[PDB]
Amino acid sequence: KVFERCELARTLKRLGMDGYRGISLANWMCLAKWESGYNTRATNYNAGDRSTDYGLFQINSRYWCNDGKTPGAVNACHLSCSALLQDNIADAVACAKRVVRDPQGIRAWVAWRNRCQNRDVRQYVQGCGV
């Protein structure tokens, strides 16, 4: 599923992402935008290390979910990576919450540093009523 901006903003707020571990909703929106373009079925294979990024938040199979083919991987979210490809983003949100519970927080995603950090991210939630 490809979410429309405000639709996703309202969904994430309902799922308790606003201010989760100090991360504003606008930051989560900026992250989803640059990671998948709000697309839940997006997959990206990293030929360099044999891991794959899955879904809305492009969560990596080496540490967060299990896909069975990634060498030396753990599955911290205790989920099959298939779960991160559903239209229902409940599981993806619970895993995204798990990721930021680590010391790095939102910085775990390099796209966030490049495209969201120290920027005016207000645009991602403007007019959405959240």
List the determination method: X-ray
Residue type, 15: L
Q: Are strands 51-54 and 59-60 parallel, antiparallel or unpaired?
A: antiparallel
Active-site residue among 4, 7, 53, 87?
A: 53
33 — phi, psi (to 5°)? -60, -50
Active-site residue among 35, 87, 91, 120?
A: 35
- Is residue 67 among the annotated active site residues? no
Q: Which CATH architecture has domain 1-130?
A: Orthogonal Bundle (1.10)
Residue 64: both structure tokens together = 């967060």
Contact between residue 54 and residue 61 where contact means Cβ atoms under 8 Å apart: yes
CB contact burial 17-56 (16+ within 10 A = b; e otherwise): bbebeebbbbbbbbbbbbbbebebebeeeeeeeebbbbbb
Resolution in A: 1.8
Q: Where are the domains of the chain?
A: 1-130
Widest Cα–Cα separation across the chain: 44
- Is residue 7 among the annotated active site residues? no
Residue 42: both structure tokens together = 């997006």
Alpha helices by DSSP H, listed for 37-103, are: 90-100
